[PDB]
């Protein structure tokens, strides 16, 4: 039995931690909703 619990408001935060890169990837999406890399 699944249940939900509130975790916060949805708002943009100024001075949030800025991280992560921006990779451009060739991908395929199958009928089961799974992404895979195309190489």
């Amino acid at each position: 039995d699944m249940y939900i619990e509130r975790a916060g408001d949805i708002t943009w935060e100024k001075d949030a931690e800025v991280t992560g890169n921006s990779p451009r990837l060739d991908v395929a999406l199958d009928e089961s909703g799974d992404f895979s890399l195309v190489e």
């Binding site: 699944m2 619990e5 509130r6 949805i10 943009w12 931690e17 800025v18 992560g20 921006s22 909703g33």
Partner: protein, 156 residues
């Protein structure tokens, strides 16, 4: 149950203790999450029940109580924020410049941020605070790191 707009954890007591299986968005009386988080099962909110209304395994999305309401899109240029809600941890905003998933059916924004599987369904926001998609369906690249699509549904 609680119907206030915001971000919510999706929990289960079926396993050991209380386990966070994912996250979702409550907006305009509709609960939005990824299909792989709930597998389309009913949800509880206090004494109330949330029944699935729309879902699609290939998009990996599901809405409860009403049709999908989120329709903002990444502009293809600006940084966005993942409002990550990790299991047992406080909601935290992380800013990033999305990359791209190139597919035979068009291009999709992608966020190269690595969080536990139970963080799936956390919202990705633009600078106006609008939800442009949900985090949690992606791929594991060469170096073992995780890259999620910015998955968004259609507002009918």
């Amino acid at each position: 149950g609680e119907t206030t707009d915001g971000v919510y954890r999706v929990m289960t007591r079926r396993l050991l203790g209380s386990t966070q299986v994912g996250v979702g968005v409550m907006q305009e009386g509709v609960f939005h999450t990824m299909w792989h988080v709930t597998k389309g099962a009913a949800l509880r909110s206090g004494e109330g029940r949330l029944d699935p209304y729309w879902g699609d395994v290939k998009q990996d999305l599901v809405s409860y109580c009403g049709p999908w309401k989120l329709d903002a899109a990444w502009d293809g240029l600006s940084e966005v924020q993942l409002l990550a809600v990790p299991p047992g941890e406080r909601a935290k905003n992380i800013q990033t410049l999305p990359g791209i998933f190139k597919t035979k059916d068009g291009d999709i924004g992608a966020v190269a941020l690595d969080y536990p599987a139970g963080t799936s369904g956390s919202p990705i926001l633009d600078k106006c605070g609008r939800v442009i998609g949900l985090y949690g369906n992606g791929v594991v690249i060469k170096n073992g790191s995780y890259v999620s699509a910015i998955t968004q549904g259609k507002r009918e």
